Amino acid sequence: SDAPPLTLEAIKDRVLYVLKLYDKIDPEKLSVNSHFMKDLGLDSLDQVEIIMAMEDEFGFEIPDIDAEKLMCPQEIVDYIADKKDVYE
């Protein structure tokens, strides 16, 4: 058997886990609607690093044209779910 059918809850949990292991983000201040630029005060390079971290975690690469405009954890989980045809 191959990998189990990854669901929405797993994606959200793992994205928030990776973001909570980031030393530039306060874990209790971070939510799933938290904007990276406003609600956390990070700059463009930090967003690039977060995108690469999620790429490394989920085993697939998000192109630069699509990745540059993901500024919330909900946006990231939505993009990952749409890429993998996660509907539940």
Binding site: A3, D56, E57, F58, G59
Partner: protein, 110 residues
């Protein structure tokens, strides 16, 4: 050579299937303990490939090298054969070192 080369490829396929269809050794961490049977089979195959004494590769490869050393042949061909014999152990070490020793480099979902 059929024996150990075929089983080396089968070990590589086991590794690839286990690590979510990953083939690059730069993302294969510590599988010496995570895959004990695969690592023992790959070690035995790499030792047979390099001509470790009294293995299947021994009885053919050492005899071939001895016959090459004891023949009226090209000097350059002899030297190239010896250097290739060294590089065989070189790349076997490459595979074992980069795939089975060290720390994990694969995605967290194991």
């Amino acid at each position: 050579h059929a024996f150990f080369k075929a089983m080396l490829f089968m070990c590589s396929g086991s590794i690839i299937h286990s690590l979510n269809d990953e083939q690059d050794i730069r993302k294969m961490g510590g599988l010496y303990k995570a895959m004990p049977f695969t690592t023992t089979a790959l070690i035995i195959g790499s030792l047979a490939l390099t001509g470790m004494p009294y293995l299947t590769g021994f009885y053919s490869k050492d005899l071939i090298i001895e016959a090459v050393n004891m023949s009226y042949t090209n000097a350059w061909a002899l030297l190239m054969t010896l250097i290739a014999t060294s590089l065989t152990a070189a790349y076997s070490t490459r595979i074992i070192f980069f795939a089975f020793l060290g720390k994990p480099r694969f995605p967290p979902l194991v």
